[PDB]
Amino acid sequence: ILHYEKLSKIGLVKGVTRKYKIKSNPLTKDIVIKMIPNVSNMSQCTGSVMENYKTRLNGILTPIKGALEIYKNNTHDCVGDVRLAGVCMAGVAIGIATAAQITAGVALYEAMKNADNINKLKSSIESTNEAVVKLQETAEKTVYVFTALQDYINTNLVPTIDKIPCKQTELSLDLALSKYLSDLLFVFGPNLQDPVSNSMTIQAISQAFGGNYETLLRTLGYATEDFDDLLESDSITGQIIYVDLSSYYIIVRVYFPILTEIQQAYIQELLPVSFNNDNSEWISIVPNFILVRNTLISNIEIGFCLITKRSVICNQDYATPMTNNMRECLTGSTEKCPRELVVSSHVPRFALSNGVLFANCISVTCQCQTTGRAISQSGEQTLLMIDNTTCPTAVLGNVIISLGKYLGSVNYNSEGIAIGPPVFTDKVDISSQISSMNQSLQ
Amino acid sequence: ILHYEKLSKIGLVKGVTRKYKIKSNPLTKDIVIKMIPNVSNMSQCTGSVMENYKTRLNGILTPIKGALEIYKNNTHDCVGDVRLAGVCMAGVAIGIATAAQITAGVALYEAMKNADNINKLKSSIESTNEAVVKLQETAEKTVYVFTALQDYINTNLVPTIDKIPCKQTELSLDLALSKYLSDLLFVFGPNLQDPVSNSMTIQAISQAFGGNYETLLRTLGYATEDFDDLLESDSITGQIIYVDLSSYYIIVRVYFPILTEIQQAYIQELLPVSFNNDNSEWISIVPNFILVRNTLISNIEIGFCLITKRSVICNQDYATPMTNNMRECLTGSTEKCPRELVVSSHVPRFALSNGVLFANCISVTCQCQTTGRAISQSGEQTLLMIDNTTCPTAVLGNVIISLGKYLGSVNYNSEGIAIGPPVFTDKVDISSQISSMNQSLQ
Amino acid sequence: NMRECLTGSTEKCPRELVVSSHVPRFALSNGVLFANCISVTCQCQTTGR
Amino acid sequence: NMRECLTGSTEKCPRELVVSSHVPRFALSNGVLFANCISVTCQCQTTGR
C-alpha cells in the first residue's frame, strides 16, 4: 500500500519490515518480597537503627495498605449460579475508579484466594534469612521469598562483625538501610499513588530487591525463548496483593505473558535521505515507523515499544491515528509530504535498499570505479539511483560499494516528481507559525 | 407469602421449610480410565479373546472419538488480541450444535492443553496394571489411572492360573469381558450420542470402572463437607476429553463444584390431610413442594432434586412456572384450590405441625385423654385443630400425643372457609374432561 | 393445531415462561447462530463492538 | 477555547479517533458508572438482561 518509488524520490528510502506483536494471555506466579532483612545473627549490638528503620518503613508502607484496603473492604464473592459467580464490588464505597483500576481490583480479589494461603506462612516468611528462599505452599504448589537486604548483611556485616568496632557496623548498617530507602522512594514512595494497578514493571518492582530483576525471573523460570523481549518492552508486570506492617513483607503476583504476533500487521521503517531542490538540501518530515494492519495505515508511538531486528514488540497496543494527508502522502500523493531545510552538516545523504543505492550526488561526490569517472547529478533531479545497470561498482567518499539491480522502473533516474512545502519543526516554531496564520486570517 | 392458616383447613398442613442451593464454581480434576485390562501376567494362555475384545471395544469407542473429532478438527486458539481471550470455533464445519454442546466444546479445548501433557504419558498409561494408579504429568501435577478389570484379574484369575485348566480361565475371562461390555453399553454404547457434554454424572462414568465411583471420588478427594449432597443430586459430573483407539483408554475431566445457597429463597413442603365436605372425604391437589425466591412463588420440578432435612439441592436451577390460580390458591384464595375425592382407605387423615395436630375427627376415632370424653367434629367443620386449649393430651386410634400452644387465631375451630371444585387426576381422566368440555362448548 | 403450528402457523405454538436460569439461550444450525442477545451479551470480534 | 470547553461548551472540546485496542472504556465516579456499552459487553445482574 506504500508506494516506495515516490517515497524514495522524495528521500524516504525503503527500510526493514518488522512484524507487530503485543503482550497477551498472561500466566501468573506469586512471590513475596520481605523489605526488611533478618539481622538475627548480627543483632548483638545492632543498636536502635532497627527500630528507626521499622518506623520509616511503616510510614512508607502504610499508604500502600491504605489504598489496598479500599478494594479489600469492598470486594466480596457474589452468591448463586445465576452469574459467573465471581466478585461483587461495593462501588459506592470505592467512589473513584478507572477501568484499569477496577480490573486490577478483580485480579487482586482473584489473587486473594492464594494470598490467604501464603499469609498462613507468616511465621515461615519472617524466618527467612537468605536473599532467595523457596517454600512449599502445598503438596502440589510453591512460593518464593526474596529478602531486600540479606546478601549484603550475610556477605559483609556478618563476616566483619568483629574485625571492626561494633559502632562502625552500626553506621554501615544505617547507611545501607538508608541507601535502600533512597533507591526505594522512586517506586514505593509517595510516587506510588495507585498500588492496586498491575501496570508496574518487574524492573520497578525489583527496586525493592536491590534492582536485581534477573534473579526474580531466573528463579521463577525462563518460560519461553522470547524472554529478553517481554523483559525489555515492559511486558512483564507485577501487582502488590497484600501488604503486612508487622513483618514488613509484600506479596507480588508476577505476570508472564506470551507474545502474539498480530496477523496482517507489519511495521515499516523509512530511512530519510537529504535531497537537492532549488539549490539547497532538504529532508522530508515523515514518521520513521508506520504501522500498516488490515490494509489500514496508522502511526505508532514506538518510543515505548521495542524495535528488534525482525519484530516490533509492545506491552500494549500503541497504535495511534495518522492524518489523512499523511496517508495520501504515503500512498503516492507526494506533494502533501512536508520537508525541512537542513542546515546541519551531519545529516545522512545516501542510503542502500535492496542493494540499489540512492544518493544526493550534488551534496556528496560520486564517481564510478569501473569507468574511472565522476557520477553527475543534475540540478533538477532530487536523488540519483545507482545500480548495476548504471555501473556495478560506485564509490561515495571513502567507501567502495557494489550494487545490485533495481526492481522498479528502468527509467527511474529520468522521471521527476512534485515537491511539497517547507516546514519548521522547532517547539517555538509551532507557536511562531500559529501566530502568523492567525494574523493572516485576521 | 403463604397463608398456612387458610391452607390448613383445606388440608394443607404446614411442613418443613428447606433452603435452596445449586451447584456453582466447579473445580476441574483430570483422570484417565483404561477400558481394557492389562493381561500381561496371564498372557500365557489368554487365547484369542483379547483380539475379539479389542475389535468389539473399538466398535464402541470409534463413534465417541468420531463425535469428539468434530470438535478437535474444528477447535484452535485465536490471536487473542483481535478480541478478549477465548477459543475459536470452526462453526461452518460444526453445523449443528446447542449452547451446551458449544460450552462443552470450549471446556474440551481448554482441557486439551492438559490432555496433551497426559498423552505425553501414553506408554506409562498403557503399562498400568493396578485398578488405581497415581502418575505425574509434572512435579507440581499428579494424574490418576483407573484400569478396567485389572483388580478382578489380579485377585481371582491370576491366582487360579494353574489350579484349573486354563482353557476354563480363557472362558471365564471371555465371560468377564462380555459382562463388562454389557454393563458398559447402557452408558458408553449407542446411547452416548453426545460425548461433547458435561451433563453426564460420575455415577454413569464409573460404569467404565465397574460402577465404583466411590474409589474415583475418595482417591481424588473429599474437598467439601457437603460431599454426599453433591453426589446424590447428580451434581458431580465429568466429560470425556480424549479417546485413544490403540491403548483403549479415555481421559475424563471430573468436576467438583460447591453448593451455593440461593439467597432469599426457601422450599416449603405442604402435607395433605383428608377433610370432610358433604359427607365424604377429599384430598386437595396442590404441589407438595413450593419454591419461593425473592418473594416470587413458583413450582419446582423436585423429582431430580435431592431433599434433605434442611435444604433442597439440585444440579440445575430446576424452578418451573406456576399457574396464577395456584398462586392465588397458595396465598389465601382457597376457592381456587383443587380437591380430589378419596376412594382409597389408605390416605393420611391427621398431621402434626408446630406441636398442634389437624385431624379428621369423624373418619378416625377421635377422643381426648385428660377428660376421657370423645372429641366431636360437626359436619360443617372440615378439620379440627386439637391443641392443649381443648385438652393437653389427645388420643387418635392407638397413639396418645401431647400437644402445645397454637400461634394463630384462637377461635380457629369456629371459623369455616369456602371450598373449591372437585378434580380427577388420572391420565385418562384428563382426556375425558377435555372431550366433555369441548363437546359442551360446541 | 400442532400440525398447523409446525407448518408455519406459529401463533398456535404454545409457549412457557422461563423460571430456570439454566435454559439454553443460543444454538448453531448450518453455521448460522440463533441467539437471544437480550439475555446473553453478543459482541462479534471483527467489528469489535 | 480550552477554558470554554471545560466550563460547558463541549462543542469546543477536541477529540481524537481511537486506534489502540487498549483504551479505557468504563470509569466509576461517585458510585455511578459511565461506560461505552456498545464497545464493551454490558448487562444487568438483578434481571440478567
XYZ file of C-alpha atoms in Angstrom, chain A:
442
model
C 0.000 0.000 0.000
C 3.087 2.164 0.485
C 4.415 3.292 -2.893
C 8.151 3.119 -2.420
C 9.271 4.822 -5.643
C 7.881 8.309 -4.996
C 8.893 7.976 -1.341
C 12.454 7.227 -2.445
C 12.465 10.123 -4.899
C 11.415 12.465 -2.086
C 14.054 10.878 0.133
C 12.309 8.130 2.120
C 14.261 5.034 1.113
C 12.995 1.559 1.992
C 13.921 0.172 5.379
C 13.438 -3.109 7.215
C 9.944 -4.566 7.579
C 9.129 -5.954 11.026
C 6.141 -7.825 12.410
C 3.922 -6.396 15.141
C 3.479 -8.353 18.389
C 1.697 -7.462 21.633
C 1.722 -8.983 25.169
C -1.150 -11.478 25.617
C -2.652 -14.321 27.765
C -0.579 -13.704 30.974
C 0.255 -16.583 33.266
C 0.660 -15.756 36.987
C 3.271 -16.669 39.632
C 3.135 -15.478 43.253
C 6.177 -14.401 45.283
C 6.822 -12.372 48.436
C 9.441 -9.674 48.978
C 10.493 -9.062 52.582
C 11.502 -5.385 52.520
C 13.162 -5.860 55.934
C 16.243 -8.065 56.425
C 16.755 -10.643 59.141
C 19.527 -9.345 61.401
C 19.311 -12.217 63.881
C 22.906 -13.428 63.538
C 24.198 -9.850 63.961
C 21.613 -8.496 66.419
C 24.046 -8.488 69.366
C 24.837 -4.772 69.005
C 22.755 -3.564 66.056
C 21.673 -0.623 68.197
C 18.447 1.312 67.739
C 18.706 1.677 63.947
C 16.435 -1.357 63.563
C 13.549 0.411 65.319
C 14.009 3.663 63.386
C 14.114 1.774 60.092
C 10.995 -0.040 61.283
C 9.148 3.255 61.769
C 10.337 4.678 58.441
C 9.304 1.530 56.567
C 5.943 1.594 58.354
C 5.474 5.194 57.267
C 6.204 4.335 53.646
C 4.191 1.088 53.554
C 1.123 2.444 55.368
C -0.340 4.368 52.370
C 0.069 1.275 50.174
C -2.018 -0.864 52.521
C -4.442 2.028 52.960
C -5.053 2.172 49.216
C -5.293 -1.625 49.033
C -7.895 -1.741 51.817
C -10.217 0.438 49.729
C -10.629 -2.620 47.475
C -10.106 -5.266 50.179
C -13.056 -3.978 52.272
C -15.200 -3.558 49.144
C -14.506 -6.913 47.395
C -16.805 -9.937 48.016
C -17.984 -13.140 46.228
C -21.439 -12.659 44.646
C -23.811 -15.559 45.587
C -25.591 -18.154 43.371
C -25.222 -19.973 39.995
C -27.109 -17.210 38.074
C -23.990 -15.116 37.195
C -20.364 -16.304 36.635
C -20.431 -16.205 40.474
C -17.244 -14.095 40.818
C -16.619 -10.924 42.895
C -19.105 -8.142 43.832
C -17.865 -4.509 44.083
C -19.102 -2.079 46.787
C -18.891 0.615 44.093
C -20.426 3.368 46.294
C -17.734 2.642 48.932
C -14.961 2.739 46.232
C -16.131 6.138 44.885
C -13.496 6.948 42.191
C -12.081 4.234 39.943
C -10.992 3.660 36.351
C -11.444 0.609 34.142
C -7.829 -0.440 34.655
C -8.068 0.154 38.400
C -11.248 -1.957 38.702
C -9.717 -4.701 36.502
C -6.678 -4.751 38.852
C -9.146 -4.864 41.785
C -10.722 -8.012 40.310
C -7.266 -9.585 39.799
C -6.455 -8.546 43.411
C -9.504 -10.448 44.755
C -8.747 -13.418 42.465
C -5.230 -13.493 43.937
C -6.601 -13.194 47.486
C -7.670 -16.856 47.244
C -3.936 -17.733 47.120
C -2.746 -14.788 49.268
C -4.674 -16.106 52.276
C -2.800 -19.402 51.956
C 0.577 -17.597 51.594
C -0.287 -15.436 54.663
C -0.744 -18.719 56.619
C 3.058 -18.955 56.120
C 3.661 -15.658 58.030
C 5.984 -17.263 60.586
C 7.983 -19.017 57.805
C 8.233 -15.719 55.828
C 9.565 -13.984 58.971
C 12.087 -16.796 59.489
C 13.703 -16.325 56.036
C 17.370 -15.317 56.277
C 18.579 -15.808 52.656
C 18.266 -13.390 49.732
C 16.286 -16.074 47.823
C 14.253 -18.863 49.538
C 11.780 -21.455 48.144
C 8.828 -22.581 50.325
C 6.137 -25.269 49.915
C 2.715 -23.623 49.572
C 1.007 -27.083 49.207
C 1.988 -30.680 48.271
C 1.426 -29.510 44.594
C 2.405 -25.763 44.956
C 5.377 -23.497 45.862
C 6.192 -19.822 46.624
C 9.431 -17.763 46.738
C 10.648 -15.257 49.344
C 13.129 -12.529 48.403
C 14.931 -10.625 51.215
C 15.516 -6.908 50.409
C 18.901 -6.726 52.245
C 20.144 -10.252 53.040
C 23.019 -10.621 50.573
C 24.777 -7.500 51.859
C 24.338 -8.446 55.516
C 25.420 -12.065 55.078
C 28.402 -11.215 52.856
C 29.823 -8.138 54.610
C 28.352 -7.376 58.025
C 28.256 -10.906 59.473
C 31.850 -11.754 58.403
C 33.106 -8.330 59.574
C 31.195 -8.335 62.871
C 34.382 -8.386 64.975
C 37.287 -7.127 62.835
C 35.991 -3.536 63.165
C 34.389 -1.609 66.072
C 30.722 -2.518 66.505
C 29.686 1.145 66.393
C 31.131 1.250 62.883
C 28.974 -1.745 61.963
C 26.015 0.256 63.319
C 26.779 3.186 60.938
C 27.453 0.912 57.911
C 24.078 -0.805 58.580
C 22.260 2.529 58.980
C 23.852 3.741 55.748
C 22.898 0.538 53.936
C 19.259 0.789 55.014
C 19.148 4.490 54.140
C 20.555 3.681 50.694
C 17.847 1.041 50.285
C 15.171 3.569 51.245
C 16.595 6.197 48.882
C 16.557 3.730 45.984
C 13.069 2.666 47.072
C 11.361 6.061 47.223
C 11.381 6.420 43.429
C 8.954 3.479 43.156
C 7.456 2.603 46.557
C 7.426 6.161 47.902
C 4.683 8.775 47.552
C 5.004 8.428 43.768
C 3.014 5.177 44.104
C -0.438 6.741 44.246
C -2.140 3.623 42.815
C -0.617 0.357 44.108
C -3.701 -1.610 43.033
C -2.920 -1.434 39.309
C -0.735 -4.053 37.618
C 0.926 -1.749 35.067
C 4.115 -1.609 37.149
C 7.112 -3.263 35.517
C 9.147 -6.037 37.093
C 12.182 -3.759 36.775
C 10.471 -1.216 39.028
C 9.403 -3.960 41.448
C 12.966 -5.275 41.707
C 13.980 -1.935 43.239
C 12.538 -3.469 46.408
C 15.081 -6.267 45.863
C 18.029 -4.031 45.025
C 17.188 -3.749 41.329
C 18.021 -7.404 40.590
C 15.066 -8.486 38.467
C 17.159 -11.081 36.624
C 17.139 -13.154 39.852
C 13.364 -12.821 40.195
C 12.834 -14.018 36.620
C 15.501 -16.744 36.587
C 14.258 -18.293 39.850
C 10.666 -18.218 38.526
C 11.848 -19.604 35.138
C 12.632 -18.651 31.536
C 9.276 -19.847 30.243
C 9.953 -19.036 26.581
C 12.644 -18.151 24.057
C 11.217 -14.608 23.756
C 12.328 -13.809 27.308
C 14.610 -10.802 26.651
C 11.617 -9.366 24.690
C 8.816 -9.485 27.336
C 11.630 -8.091 29.557
C 12.696 -5.005 27.589
C 9.293 -3.998 26.220
C 7.979 -3.692 29.816
C 5.559 -6.552 29.145
C 6.416 -8.432 32.355
C 4.362 -6.667 35.033
C 3.538 -7.353 38.668
C 0.914 -6.399 41.234
C 1.034 -5.996 45.006
C -1.801 -8.014 46.546
C -1.045 -7.966 50.284
C 0.995 -5.611 52.464
C 1.930 -6.581 56.019
C 3.029 -3.929 58.507
C 4.167 -6.381 61.201
C 6.668 -8.475 59.224
C 7.166 -5.801 56.514
C 6.737 -8.136 53.524
C 4.567 -7.735 50.389
C 3.142 -10.420 48.105
C 3.565 -9.756 44.372
C 1.798 -11.601 41.544
C 4.188 -11.615 38.583
C 2.659 -11.862 35.109
C 4.439 -13.745 32.305
C 2.502 -13.114 29.075
C 3.032 -14.671 25.645
C 3.817 -12.598 22.578
C 1.062 -12.906 19.992
C 2.204 -11.782 16.575
C -0.703 -9.835 15.109
C -1.720 -11.287 11.709
C -1.943 -8.896 8.635
C 0.107 -6.341 10.661
C 3.685 -5.251 9.922
C 5.844 -2.302 10.934
C 7.668 -0.430 8.176
C 10.753 1.722 8.763
C 11.598 4.540 6.346
C 15.143 5.880 6.036
C 15.333 9.653 5.408
C 17.881 10.915 2.868
C 18.667 14.559 2.171
C 17.686 15.539 -1.361
C 18.574 18.511 -3.535
C 15.986 21.009 -4.746
C 16.189 24.714 -5.634
C 19.937 24.759 -4.931
C 19.560 23.654 -1.302
C 19.327 20.483 0.777
C 16.055 19.328 2.329
C 14.879 16.412 4.464
C 11.253 15.271 4.497
C 9.393 15.156 7.819
C 7.541 11.834 7.970
C 7.271 9.157 10.653
C 10.239 6.818 10.704
C 7.967 3.885 11.609
C 4.493 3.280 10.167
C 2.023 0.568 11.182
C 0.015 -0.989 8.316
C -2.543 -3.578 9.565
C -5.715 -4.900 7.807
C -4.737 -2.700 4.790
C -5.320 0.166 7.304
C -2.478 2.746 7.675
C -1.907 4.166 11.181
C 1.018 5.609 13.090
C 2.730 4.003 16.042
C 4.191 5.720 19.128
C 7.241 3.379 19.044
C 9.116 5.247 21.779
C 7.625 2.900 24.375
C 7.884 -0.129 22.066
C 10.940 -2.270 21.375
C 12.325 -2.399 17.833
C 14.243 -5.639 17.351
C 15.670 -6.864 14.055
C 12.549 -8.761 12.945
C 9.599 -7.554 15.045
C 8.197 -4.573 16.936
C 7.193 -5.525 20.460
C 4.837 -3.584 22.714
C 3.338 -4.264 26.141
C 0.187 -2.513 24.879
C -1.387 -1.845 21.505
C 0.321 1.506 20.987
C -1.265 2.206 17.605
C -2.206 5.873 17.181
C -4.075 7.674 14.386
C -2.449 9.275 11.364
C -3.533 12.386 9.490
C -5.428 11.834 6.252
C -2.826 13.944 4.443
C -0.044 11.681 5.733
C -1.956 8.675 4.397
C -2.210 10.333 0.979
C 1.498 11.216 1.113
C 2.497 7.638 1.915
C 0.036 6.399 -0.740
C 1.626 8.455 -3.520
C 0.270 12.000 -3.243
C 3.841 13.115 -2.723
C 3.145 16.860 -2.838
C 1.402 16.608 0.551
C 4.568 15.405 2.306
C 6.314 18.125 4.350
C 10.023 18.840 4.022
C 12.558 20.546 6.283
C 15.516 22.575 5.073
C 18.680 21.120 6.582
C 21.376 23.380 7.992
C 23.221 20.600 9.818
C 26.228 19.129 8.029
C 25.748 15.797 9.848
C 22.606 14.606 8.054
C 22.916 11.334 6.086
C 22.988 11.881 2.330
C 22.713 8.351 0.896
C 21.093 5.025 1.710
C 21.014 1.467 0.396
C 17.839 -0.585 -0.056
C 17.664 -3.994 -1.779
C 21.238 -3.371 -2.918
C 20.345 -0.325 -5.051
C 21.926 2.952 -3.967
C 20.034 6.214 -3.512
C 22.290 9.235 -3.095
C 22.418 13.014 -3.413
C 25.395 13.332 -5.748
C 25.098 17.124 -5.659
C 25.909 17.189 -1.938
C 28.377 14.271 -1.925
C 30.987 13.485 -4.570
C 30.128 10.365 -6.584
C 32.345 8.591 -9.094
C 32.268 5.091 -10.563
C 35.266 2.789 -10.210
C 34.547 0.625 -13.270
C 34.730 3.556 -15.710
C 37.015 5.786 -13.619
C 34.860 8.895 -13.992
C 32.539 11.031 -11.900
C 28.833 10.318 -11.435
C 26.946 13.524 -12.187
C 23.650 14.710 -10.697
C 21.823 17.484 -12.500
C 20.084 20.358 -10.756
C 16.523 19.105 -11.320
C 16.983 15.512 -10.087
C 16.362 15.172 -6.356
C 18.214 11.876 -5.925
C 20.285 9.605 -8.154
C 19.610 5.876 -8.262
C 22.778 3.872 -8.904
C 22.594 0.149 -9.670
C 24.423 -2.409 -11.800
C 22.838 -1.056 -14.986
C 24.370 2.333 -14.172
C 27.661 0.713 -13.144
C 28.372 -2.321 -10.929
C 30.797 -0.533 -8.566
C 30.458 3.076 -7.388
C 32.070 5.000 -4.532
C 30.918 7.711 -2.112
C 33.902 9.353 -0.473
C 35.920 6.558 1.134
C 33.574 3.584 0.558
C 33.647 1.206 -2.411
C 30.176 -0.252 -2.962
C 28.880 -2.964 -5.291
C 25.245 -2.587 -6.279
C 22.504 -4.972 -7.328
C 19.776 -4.434 -9.889
C 16.652 -2.335 -9.449
C 13.227 -3.962 -9.448
C 11.027 -0.956 -10.239
C 11.013 1.336 -13.257
C 14.050 1.016 -15.517
C 13.940 4.757 -16.340
C 13.846 5.796 -12.674
C 16.516 8.496 -12.880
C 14.836 10.230 -15.841
C 11.431 10.835 -14.203
C 10.751 13.714 -11.821
C 8.087 14.331 -9.185
C 6.359 17.229 -7.458
C 7.693 18.531 -4.146
C 5.811 19.752 -1.096
C 6.020 22.898 1.001
C 8.721 23.596 3.600
C 8.107 23.165 7.323
C 9.891 24.051 10.559
C 9.687 21.634 13.483
C 11.126 23.554 16.439
C 8.996 23.856 19.570
C 8.925 27.656 19.323
C 8.444 27.456 15.542
C 4.995 25.909 16.038
C 3.937 28.843 18.217
C 5.515 31.300 15.772
C 3.740 29.738 12.785
C 0.356 29.584 14.541
C 0.539 33.320 15.243
C 1.417 34.042 11.607
C -1.551 32.132 10.173
C -3.868 33.624 12.802
C -2.676 37.130 11.914
C -3.014 36.275 8.218
C -6.585 35.079 8.787
C -7.489 38.303 10.612
